[PDB]
Structures are given as structure tokens and as C-alpha cells.
Amino acid sequence: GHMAVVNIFGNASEYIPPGYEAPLGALTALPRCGTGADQGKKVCIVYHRCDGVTNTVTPEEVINTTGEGIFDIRENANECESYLDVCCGLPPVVPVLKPSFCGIRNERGLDFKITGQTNEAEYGEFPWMVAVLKANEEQLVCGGSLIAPSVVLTGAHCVNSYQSNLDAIKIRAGEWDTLTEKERLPYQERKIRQVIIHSNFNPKTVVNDVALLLLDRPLVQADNIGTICLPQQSQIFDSTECFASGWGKKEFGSRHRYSNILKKIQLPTVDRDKCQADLRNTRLGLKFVLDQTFVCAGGEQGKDTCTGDGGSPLFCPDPRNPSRYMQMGIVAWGIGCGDENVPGVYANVAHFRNWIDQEMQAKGLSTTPYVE
Ligand SMILES: *[C@@H]1O[C@H](CO[C@@H]2O[C@@H](C)[C@@H](O)[C@@H](O)[C@@H]2O)[C@@H](O[C@@H]2O[C@H](CO)[C@@H](O)[C@H](O)[C@H]2NC(C)=O)[C@H](O[C@@H]2O[C@@H](C)[C@@H](O)[C@@H](O)[C@@H]2O)[C@H]1NC(C)=O
Ligand SMILES: [Ca+2]
């Protein structure tokens, strides 16, 4: 009954400014590198502690703005074991709150552009990708999207069973490679203060599979953190450039691989009526009716594993502003991404715009972060 006053007086609708709120240790203790005259004389150090021009270790964190960095993510492809380490030679101003814009993709990646990749997303490519994790299949419960500094959008099926046990879960934003913390901008975690599950959600037919996660405190502003824009109520998407993105429940944080970088897959929208038709052609029969709370996108030919995690966002370009992205869907089933002949079925975000606006307003939370 007092969530409103806290959110209003606490400015829960804005990011906490940077600076407002792990020493590498002895350089000699770092793994050696270098060949020729430098053999064994240089050190393997996280890129943000090695000057890009002088190739020399730095006393403090440094930021490369040349936009010419290219990192090969493949194991054994670099001088150093870790692709985020640079073979370096032996030897900041904290900005205020900046303006924020929803749906901004970093197509070229933050800090560096990757190479040697298959379906990996650039570092910080989609700043709104959030992971819902067990605080206590494995660590990752579901995916989700940041729609406001203190609000995450996900599927009801994801948190329905944690309503009376919110302490068992948490969210992680700004994540990229779940197997290392070498990324310059770190991930951020927050406890979930409340969960708002749509009133007409039904776990059987999976209709109205949407929920809001209200965080205990807003996220800190950073380039690897950003909201996704929401569509207008009833909006219909038409694009060949949407994306699904995820880490995989089994892979997330599983220290049995070289890396677990956020993955992405480009997919086109599929008209509602056509989709129902494709579904009717399956054993579902021509009597099957696709509920209005679902939308479709194209599937993959040779199938194996779906890219978007349950509850994660299916997003497409804003037709009125092609440079930014809007959320079209929510992954209802991690295994329901379809194939070459049968489209993937997702929760229809546009059908819930008014509902989201209303829940936000009732909590004293501004909706501008997913509009501007
Ligand atoms: C809640 O936010 C208020 C407004 O913040 C300003 O506008 C935001 C959009 C953003 O740009 C932010 O950076 C701006 O500062 C704060 O009030 C402002 O506080 C600053 C100093 O912190 C002060 O210089 C401004 O005059 C003041 N603006 C006003 C009068 O609204 C709130 O800060 C608290 O309340 C203030 C009245 C002041 O007593 C301040 O010392 C308090 O920290 C923010 N509240 C909280 C809990 O942080
Ligand atoms: Ca990481």
C-alpha cells in the first residue's frame, strides 16, 4: 500500500547516476606472454587495464574510444588464454546523469567488435536483455527485458510460482559472457520487490503470459544498460529484421565451456492469419484458433536448440523510427521457436500495452523510459 510514495519520493523512474554508489593484484602474478625479444616479459591483462595505443599496463581503468578494437572470441585464437585479455607491456572523471533513450542497439558492440563468431551478439548489443536467476535448467530461470530503470518485463510462467518466495530469485542486467567478469562494464543485480502477474494468465492455454518485476532499487546508468521501447496497443509488426536473444538455461553460468556469450538470431514477422493457417496445417487441425494474445515469427530450417530464453523479448525495429527497437513478443516456451514451415509462437506484447501502462501508473512509475 506504500509502493507509490517510495517510487515517487525515491525517484524510482530514473537510473541511479554512475559513481554515486576487485584489484588485479601484483602484476607479476599475472600470466606471462610475448614472443621474440619480449618472450615471457609481457603480461596477459584484462583489456581495460592496457592502453590501446601504448600497449602498456595502466594505473587505472581506461576506455578505448577509437572504435577500432576487434576481438576474436574463439578459444586458442589469441596470445592470451582469455579473449578478453591483451598481451600488455609492463609499466577517472565520473559523469552525471545523462539523457536516456529506449531501444538503442549497439550494432558494432561496446568497447570492441567481435570476430570468429557464429550466433554471438556483440558486447552490449541489446542493453535491455535481462536474466532472471536463482538467488539461492540450473541458474537461469528465464529471460526478460528492461522497460524502466526499476522494471523488468517477462512471462508470467516465469515467476508465477515465486509470488510468495521472491527472495529465491533475482535479476541480472548488463550481462554478456556469463563465464567471465572481465567485461569493462559489469552486470548489475537487483532483488525483486514485487511481481505483477496479469489477471487473466492461464498456465494451460498460455494466454496472457506476461508479468512485471518491480526491482528494490533502480539500475545504475551505464552503456551496457538500457530499456526497450514498447509498442502501441494493438500495434502489428511487419519486419524481416526482428531478433530473439538468449544464453540457454543449461549453458548460463555453466563452467564447463570456454564461454557463454549472449546469442542472437534474426527472424521475420509472420502475419497472424497466415500463422494460424500454418498451425492448422499441422496435426492441430483446421479448427485450431490462434488466440489474439499470441503473435508469430519465422522459425529455423534444420532445428536443434532455440535462441531466446523463456520470458525473453522478441524485438523489432520501430517502423516510425527504424534506428531503435520495440518489443513485439515474449518467449512463451523456450522450445517453441518453430521451424522452416511452422512459425514460432510468442506472447503478443502490443496486446498488453494498456495493461502495462496502467500497472506502472498505479505504482507511481513513469512510462517515459519505454517511450522516449
Ligand atoms: C529526486 O530527484 C530530485 C530531482 O533531481 C533532479 O532532476 C532529475 C530529473 C535529475 O536530473 C537529477 O540529477 C536532478 O538533481 C532531487 O532534487 C534535486 O536534488 C538536487 C541535489 O541532489 C538539487 O540540487 C535540486 O535542487 C533538487 N531539485 C528539486 C528541488 O527537485 C531529489 O533530491 C532530494 O530532494 C531535493 C529537494 C534535495 O533536498 C536533495 O538534497 C535531496 O537529495 C531526489 N530525491 C532523492 C531521494 O534523491
Ligand atoms: Ca560477464
| SS3 sequence of the chain | CCHHHHHHHCCCCCCECCCCCCCCCCHHHCCEECCHHHCCCEEEEEHHHECCCCCEECCCCCCCCCCCCEEECCCCCCCCCCCCEEEEECCCCCCCCCCCCCCECCCCCCCCEEECCCCECCCCCCCCEEEEEECCCCCEEEEEEEEECCEEEECHHHHHHHCCCHHHEEEEECCCECCCCCCCCCCEEEEEEEEEECCCCCCCCCCCCCEEEEECCCCECCCCCCCCECCCCCCCCCCCCEEEEECCCCCCCCCCCCCCECEEEEECEECHHHHHHHHHCCCCCCCCCCCCCEEEECCECCCCCCCCCCCCEEEEEECCEEEEEEEEEEECCCCCCCECCCCEEEEEHHHHHHHHHHHHHHCCCCCHHHCC
CATH 2.40.10.10 range(s) for the chain read: 1-21+92-101+127-227+348-372, 102-126+228-347
Q: Which three cell numbers stand for residue 327?
A: 518489443
User: How many Cβ atoms sit within 10 Å of the Cβ of residue 160?
Assistant: 14
Query: Looking at ligand 1, which residue's alpha carbon is closest to its atom 10?
Result: 97
Burial class of residue 136 in the structure, from the number of CB atoms within 10 Å of its CB (0-12 exposed, 13-18 middle, 19+ buried): exposed
Half-sphere exposure of 207 (CA within 13 A, CB side): 9
What is the CA(216)–ligand 2 centre distance, in A? 22
Q: What is the C-alpha separation between 194 and 175, in angstroms, rounded?
A: 22
Angle 288-291-296 from CA coordinates, rounded to 5°: 95
Tell me, which fold does domain 1-21+92-101+127-227+348-372 have in CATH? Answer: Thrombin, subunit H (2.40.10)
Residues near 66 by Cβ (< 8 Å), separated by ≥ 6? 52
CATH 3.40.50.300 fits 102-126+228-347, yes or no: no
Distances (CA, A) of 222 to 23, 187, 209, 265: 21, 10, 30, 25
Residues near 277 by Cβ (< 8 Å), separated by ≥ 6? none
Q: What is the C-alpha separation between 247 and 254, in angstroms, rounded?
A: 11
Atom nearest to 96 CA in ligand 1: 13
- Pairing between β-strand 151-154 and β-strand 211-215 as defined by DSSP bridges: antiparallel
Angle 225-128-312 from CA coordinates, rounded to 5°: 150
Residues near 283 by Cβ (< 8 Å), separated by ≥ 6? none
Atom nearest to 10 CA in ligand 1: 47
Beta bridge mates, 229:
326
Q: What is the C-alpha separation between 211 and 139, in angstroms, rounded?
A: 20
Q: What is the C-alpha separation between 37 and 30, in angstroms, rounded?
A: 19
Q: Are 195 and 166 in contact (CB under 8 A)?
A: yes
Q: What is the C-alpha separation between 16 and 130, in angstroms, rounded?
A: 18
What is the CA(136)–ligand 2 centre distance, in A? 19
Q: What is the C-alpha separation between 258 and 269, in angstroms, rounded?
A: 33
Query: Looking at ligand 1, which residue's alpha carbon is closest to its atom 44?
Result: 11
Short-list 168, 182, 227, CA closest to 22: 182
| Cα dihedral 110, 113, 114, 120 sign | positive
Q: What is the C-alpha separation between 148 and 129, in angstroms, rounded?
A: 12
Deposited resolution, Å: 2.0
What is the CA(12)–ligand 1 centre distance, in A? 12
What is the CA(104)–ligand 2 centre distance, in A? 20
Which ligand lies nearest to the CA atom of residue 9 in the structure?
1
- Torsion angle of C-alpha atoms 287, 293, 299, 303, degrees rounded to 10: -80
Which ligand lies nearest to the CA atom of residue 14 in the structure?
1
Atom nearest to 17 CA in ligand 1: 13
- Torsion angle of C-alpha atoms 97, 221, 128, 316, degrees rounded to 10: 20
Burial class of residue 137 in the structure, from the number of CB atoms within 10 Å of its CB (0-12 exposed, 13-18 middle, 19+ buried): exposed
Q: Which residues surround ligand 2, an ion (CB under 5 A)?
A: 177
Which ligand lies nearest to the CA atom of residue 8 in the structure?
1
Distances (CA, A) of 94 to 18, 20, 183, 279, 355: 7, 9, 19, 54, 38
What is the CA(268)–ligand 1 centre distance, in A? 44
Short-list 16, 168, 172, CA closest to 96: 16
Q: What is the C-alpha separation between 51 and 58, in angstroms, rounded?
A: 6
User: Residues near ligand 1 with C-beta < 6 Å?
Assistant: 10-11, 14, 97
What is the CA(335)–ligand 2 centre distance, in A? 25
Which ligand lies nearest to the CA atom of residue 221 in the structure?
1
| Residue to probe by mutation, ligand 1, list 11, 150, 365, 372, most atoms within 8 Å of CB | 11
Which ligand lies nearest to the CA atom of residue 100 in the structure?
1
What is the CA(186)–ligand 2 centre distance, in A? 7
- Torsion angle of C-alpha atoms 33, 38, 39, 42, degrees rounded to 10: -20
Q: What is the CA radius of gyration of the chain?
A: 22
Distances (CA, A) of 123 to 68, 184, 224, 333: 14, 10, 8, 26
What is the CA(103)–ligand 1 centre distance, in A? 27
Beta bridge mates, 266:
243
